């Protein structure tokens, strides 16, 4: 008397296809925290985490009981690592929640950063920085040309 069925459950079942997907399916866990953790060192992430809008979405998103202070100078002055390795962890939630990519851009990170950031794509925006972290080095960082031996090759 309607289409198909009376009175069926809904939304409660919702929340079993949505596990379905997101099983966690688990991997090497070797090296989860102190790998981002790595390639975003504190120094790094400072004026990041100092940002109030970088905080106030990384405070709730703690377990409720911990903190986190307000500018730069008392990030590297304060913290000790409980806060920042938690901070590491929601910071990956913010930027995976696709919460962060807007203020990824406005630090001016690199587009390959904000664009990972923008997709939520946390393991191609740390590489960008894995990849990125080099600052400038050339003094003997430099494989353009391979020889070209324009002549008789001499050995």
Same mark, same amino acid.
């Given at each position: 008397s309607t289409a198909a069925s009376p009175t069926q459950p809904i939304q409660l079942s919702d929340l079993q296809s949505i596990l379905a997907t997101m099983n966690v399916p688990a991997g090497p866990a070797g090296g989860q925290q102190v790998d981002l953790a790595s390639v975003l060192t504190p120094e790094i992430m400072a004026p990041i985490?100092?940002?109030a809008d970088v905080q106030e979405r990384l405070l709730p998103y703690l377990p409720s009981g911990e903190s986190l202070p307000q +500018?730069?100078?008392e990030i590297q002055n304060t913290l000790t690592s409980p %806060?920042? %390795?938690q901070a590491l962890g929601m910071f990956s939630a913010a930027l995976a929640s696709g919460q962060l990519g807007p203020?990824?851009?406005q630090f001016g990170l690199p587009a390959e950063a904000v664009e990972a950031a923008n997709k939520g794509?946390? =393991?191609a925006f740390a590489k960008a920085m894995q990849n990125n972290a080099k600052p400038e %080095? /050339? =003094?003997g960082? +430099? /494989?353009d040309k391979k020889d070209e031996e324009e002549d008789m090759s001499l050995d």
């Amino acid at each position: 008397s309607t289409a198909a069925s009376p009175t069926q459950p809904i939304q409660l079942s919702d929340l079993q296809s949505i596990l379905a997907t997101m099983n966690v399916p688990a991997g090497p866990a070797g090296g989860q925290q102190v790998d981002l953790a790595s390639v975003l060192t504190p120094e790094i992430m400072a004026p990041i985490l100092a940002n109030a809008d970088v905080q106030e979405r990384l405070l709730p998103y703690l377990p409720s009981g911990e903190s986190l202070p307000q +500018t730069a100078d008392e990030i590297q002055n304060t913290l000790t690592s409980p %806060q920042f %390795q938690q901070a590491l962890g929601m910071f990956s939630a913010a930027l995976a929640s696709g919460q962060l990519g807007p203020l990824m851009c406005q630090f001016g990170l690199p587009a390959e950063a904000v664009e990972a950031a923008n997709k939520g794509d946390v =393991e191609a925006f740390a590489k960008a920085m894995q990849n990125n972290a080099k600052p400038e %080095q /050339k =003094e003997g960082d +430099t /494989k353009d040309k391979k020889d070209e031996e324009e002549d008789m090759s001499l050995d």
